[PDB]
Amino acid sequence: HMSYTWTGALITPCAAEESKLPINALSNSLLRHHNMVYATTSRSAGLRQKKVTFDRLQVLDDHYRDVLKEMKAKASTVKAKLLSVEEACKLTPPHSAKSKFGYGAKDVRNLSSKAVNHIHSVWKDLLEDTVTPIDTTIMAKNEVFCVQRKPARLIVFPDLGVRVCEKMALYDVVSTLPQVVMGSSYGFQYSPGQRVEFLVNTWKSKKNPMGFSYDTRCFDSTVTENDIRVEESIYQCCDLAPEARQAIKSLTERLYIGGPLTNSKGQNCGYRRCRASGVLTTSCGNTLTCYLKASAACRAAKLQDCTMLVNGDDLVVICESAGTQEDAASLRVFTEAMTRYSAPPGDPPQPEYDLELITSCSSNVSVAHDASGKRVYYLTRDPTTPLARAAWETARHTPVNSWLGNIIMYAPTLWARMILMTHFFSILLAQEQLEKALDCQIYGACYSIEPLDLPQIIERLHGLSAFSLHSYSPGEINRVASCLRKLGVPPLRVWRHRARSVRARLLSQGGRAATCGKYLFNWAVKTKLKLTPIPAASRLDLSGWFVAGYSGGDIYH
Ligand SMILES: COc1c(CCc2ccc(NS(C)(=O)=O)cc2)cc(-c2ccc[nH]c2=O)cc1C(C)(C)C
């Protein structure tokens, strides 16, 4: 029961790959320790292949089937619709990988006859054939990190034609099913502010709260054939059109369970028997499977009043404590149960008795004060990776602007406000690109966002307090300051100085730019302005935001 089988053919790049941080005239104003920053390339794919290749063994007990029966009962209340070819085409990202059948992502979006005729023939093939393994491309992701070097992560995706078909059959399913099955436990339905609110209310709902996060080692590769068939049986509980039932069965048998792996040069690299990281169902499948295995593991470990917070393979558990020594024992039993279910740990889980000390996927709850002096909880993270990616994006244009996604999601943080907003607004002013729409990712989905709309977006996700936070925690200030010394980033006093200039420059431009100056950089001036709700914020169509996760799902708006 190996996750993969390999032939020896290399995982090849699509274009020229850079690993060393590119340097331009702007680099040194952000980061001076250039040797600390790197991008992963196909050169390291061989090491990743070794790490993700292992035998999986599953032992399914009564807690597992009990949880599954409950999940299927909730899944049976879901009614899902088939999307038209047109609706599926419009969710396709403009720069999505082109089809091997002579058309690209822009042909799909333009509803070109060639693209639409091919999608219709793939659809007919899914309906008539439910056995033939569907070909997939295996690629090394190009992602930027700070040292202390990770090997490249792998992306496995079917052809553009198949991806449009996945949208037709499962887009409505993967968007509505998880919240119905998991209720308040489904993390992707929340904005960062709603997530903090959920975590605080849960922490306060326990007499003696205890919390931990569970890190599964190579989650996608731990996903078995059984897990993928179980996900299909959950999707089948929905009230679906008979063509949608057939397409879901076919995509499961032919694509989701496994298939051959092809490199960018057309060579066979091997065969997958685990979760594909670049399919529509990656996020939803990972969410349901993680929740199923964790919920059953919580019952097996006799964890009292367990509240899950699940986003794909990201798992947070908040429960009733039984003292430090018993909690240590319970987590070992939880881990043992997760292991039997083929979800073994990377780093073993540690019990926490302070909400701020629970870290999941580099993120944690922290505290600051609003304009009135009131204590306000917000989500932050270690800023090393966001700052390393910002340095790369200072010298190179990338398909996904991590700085923009980071300003949106981490707007209330000390580091996004003082550094990211200051730096990138300074660049956009000099380049006359304030009105240019830029792509970023929110919960794996791609969005086109104009930086001039940032104050309204921030107000809608975090409220006006994101523009007024002050008196950050000494733990948080210290992590930011330590990160700056490590990377060779100028100190916070330099950023405050530069921000007064960026603010004045934005105010001079008037209009939406002046609003950016007023709201985003009010923290920089000694005589603060009283910030009132922005009328444009209410007009913002933020539907489709915070519904579901679509990581690897090829989703645009
Ligand atoms: C953790 O929440 C997240 C997640 C969720 C991350 C996540 C995605 C997928 C999986 N797993 S998978 C691949 O199986 O679907 C797990 C976690 C993402 C972000 C975020 C930050 C900056 C830009 N864009 C963003 O979306 C922020 C949070 C906040 C809300 C903490 C700020």
Swiss-Prot record:
RNA-dependent RNA polymerase that performs primer-template recognition and RNA synthesis during viral replication. Initiates RNA transcription/replication at a flavin adenine dinucleotide (FAD), resulting in a 5'- FAD cap on viral RNAs. In this way, recognition of viral 5' RNA by host pattern recognition receptors can be bypassed, thereby evading activation of antiviral pathways. It is found in: Host cytoplasm; Host endoplasmic reticulum membrane. Its cofactor is Mg(2+). The modification Phosphoserine is found at S29, S42. This is RNA-directed RNA polymerase. The N-terminus is phosphorylated by host PRK2/PKN2. Binds 2 magnesium ion that constitute a dinuclear catalytic metal center.
